[PDB]
Amino acid sequence: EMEKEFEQIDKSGSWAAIYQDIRHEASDFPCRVAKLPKNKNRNRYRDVSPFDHSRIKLHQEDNDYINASLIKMEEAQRSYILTQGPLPNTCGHFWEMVWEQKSRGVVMLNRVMEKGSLKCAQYWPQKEEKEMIFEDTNLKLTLISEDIKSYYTVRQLELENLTTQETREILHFHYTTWPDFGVPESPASFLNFLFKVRESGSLSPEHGPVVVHCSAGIGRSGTFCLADTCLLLMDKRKDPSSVDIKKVLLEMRKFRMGLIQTADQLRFSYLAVIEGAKFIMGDSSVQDQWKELSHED
Ligand SMILES: O=C(CCc1cccc(NS(=O)(=O)O)c1)NCc1cccc(NS(=O)(=O)O)c1
Ligand SMILES: [Cl-]
Ligand SMILES: [Cl-]
Ligand SMILES: [Cl-]
Ligand SMILES: [Cl-]
Ligand SMILES: [Mg+2]
């Protein structure tokens, strides 16, 4: 049971060894397509590839490759698309994938610049009046509005398929203060944000899978999806004790490599799940408290 386990791990100081066990148990499947010569410039990181079996295929034509994985959580009945931050030559692909997969929401857990380097292209317009056209994929993207909070921004985007002129609203949930290889500032600030995504309807099974990305699409993104799926599983069962967190992370790792990149990101996942369980089990008021504690204003 997760809170008993948390305490024994903390008491014994053994997060490093627990996280290592995950690494040695994790699935290893091939990534032959990601490693083809023609795709080298579609990958941000040499050592971070989608498995072939779970990769998202673009419905082009010339080259169907994007560095993106469908994490299909069968028992939880929720799917997510995890991807790297788009590169200067893959921003059209990224929006093509959102359109073809019918996603309603994009969760971004990194900043464009982190520690002096460019970890993600500027793939969305910053000003209403300066829309983006992806000529390769025939898509147009316009900023509709934004709601800037102290550590995250929500944007309403309109994505238009220029071939059909159909338009869709995409909500962009941008967490701007989660350091790379780090953890959010508190369970509260993390959960206040996750529940904003949830409240938007972006995670509805009536939409395609939510797109989640950081820079590589594995550390911060795996921590976010792990916490959400564990909360979903105890919610479906109304039974916090039924959730095995490390088993859940190993199931997710069948779909994309490297999910959760440090032992402290694992520890933080336990914290966010233990805390979020209070809301799932019917203490509605904790949501207001997370909002206060997060200092979003
Ligand atoms: O090469 C890296 C860093 C990848 C990377 C590079 C840059 C940023 C981020 N962070 S993210 O944006 O939070 O994902 C992550 N890590 C080693 C690595 C890669 C792919 C898989 C594993 N497997 S693991 O079992 O050791 O976790 C380990
Ligand atoms: Cl940014
Ligand atoms: Cl910087
Ligand atoms: Cl970039
Ligand atoms: Cl950072
Ligand atoms: Mg203006």
Side-chain angles (χ1 to χ4, degrees):
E1 181 272 319
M2 62 182 329
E3 169 156 46
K4 179 189 190 121
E5 195 196 8
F6 182 93
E7 298 308 9
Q8 101 75 28
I9 298 159
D10 247 22
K11 173 162 174 206
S12 68
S14 63
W15 285 106
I18 291 274
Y19 179 69
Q20 268 311 123
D21 290 352
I22 284 126
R23 300 172 73 239
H24 301 286
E25 305 181 14
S27 297
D28 191 5
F29 289 108
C31 305
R32 298 181 198 127
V33 174
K35 295 292 192 186
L36 301 167
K38 62 166 167 177
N39 292 322
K40 181 158 175 215
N41 72 7
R42 288 181 180 215
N43 295 310
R44 173 171 292 281
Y45 301 110
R46 197 198 70 185
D47 293 346
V48 179
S49 294
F51 302 139
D52 297 321
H53 80 85
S54 55
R55 68 185 187 93
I56 306 290
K57 295 187 193 200
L58 306 171
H59 309 165
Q60 42 194 69
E61 302 166 15
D62 72 308
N63 183 342
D64 72 10
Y65 176 77
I66 180 172
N67 191 311
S69 300
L70 174 67
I71 290 24
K72 182 180 183 169
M73 297 310 279
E74 187 184 357
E75 184 186 9
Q77 306 178 256
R78 179 166 291 160
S79 284
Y80 319 80
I81 289 169
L82 275 55
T83 193
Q84 72 184 191
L87 286 158
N89 59 315
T90 75
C91 297
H93 308 152
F94 172 93
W95 290 111
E96 175 188 359
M97 171 177 71
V98 169
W99 184 271
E100 293 168 352
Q101 307 297 320
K102 301 171 211 304
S103 317
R104 152 83 167 143
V106 170
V107 174
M108 170 162 186
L109 297 171
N110 66 289
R111 286 175 297 130
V112 159
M113 184 166 286
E114 295 185 323
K115 291 173 293 175
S117 71
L118 282 314
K119 298 261 289 276
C120 188
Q122 185 51 58
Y123 63 90
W124 74 96
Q126 300 180 269
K127 291 179 171 182
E128 286 85 344
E129 74 273 17
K130 280 202 159 280
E131 78 282 359
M132 295 177 79
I133 305 244
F134 304 97
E135 287 284 8
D136 63 328
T137 54
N138 230 33
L139 291 157
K140 178 171 148 182
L141 180 70
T142 305
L143 177 69
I144 299 308
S145 54
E146 19 167 35
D147 179 13
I148 303 169
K149 303 279 187 204
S150 56
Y151 67 103
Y152 70 92
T153 295
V154 179
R155 311 189 179 78
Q156 186 189 347
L157 305 169
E158 172 172 301
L159 180 61
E160 170 175 357
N161 177 330
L162 296 169
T163 319
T164 66
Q165 294 190 18
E166 179 197 338
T167 69
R168 299 183 184 155
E169 165 175 293
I170 311 288
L171 298 177
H172 191 244
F173 297 92
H174 184 188
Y175 197 119
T176 59
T177 52
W178 184 337
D180 196 10
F181 299 102
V183 296
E185 160 179 277
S186 61
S189 70
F190 171 81
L191 289 167
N192 177 62
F193 179 90
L194 171 58
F195 280 84
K196 261 287 167 102
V197 180
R198 279 168 160 238
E199 284 189 357
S200 76
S202 303
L203 302 187
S204 174
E206 311 295 278
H207 291 132
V210 72
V211 170
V212 180
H213 82 85
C214 43
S215 181
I218 62 176
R220 294 165 287 177
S221 303
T223 307
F224 177 95
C225 295
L226 180 59
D228 189 55
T229 293
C230 291
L231 290 171
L232 173 61
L233 293 161
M234 61 166 79
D235 195 11
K236 295 170 139 289
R237 297 151 197 183
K238 293 302 185 295
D239 185 2
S241 70
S242 70
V243 174
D244 187 337
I245 294 172
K246 301 197 306 304
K247 195 198 184 207
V248 177
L249 179 49
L250 284 172
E251 180 60 34
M252 293 185 67
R253 275 175 175 240
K254 304 186 173 170
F255 299 94
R256 193 171 174 84
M257 71 168 59
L259 302 185
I260 295 193
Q261 279 286 289
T262 76
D264 203 43
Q265 285 171 349
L266 182 58
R267 172 175 189 282
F268 181 90
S269 288
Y270 274 71
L271 290 180
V273 176
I274 291 151
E275 173 68 18
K278 294 173 177 174
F279 182 79
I280 296 312
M281 302 302 285
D283 188 2
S284 303
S285 92
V286 259
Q287 176 169 24
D288 295 330
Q289 319 188 44
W290 303 334
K291 177 180 174 242
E292 283 313 307
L293 297 169
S294 74
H295 308 120
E296 61 169 44
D297 291 338

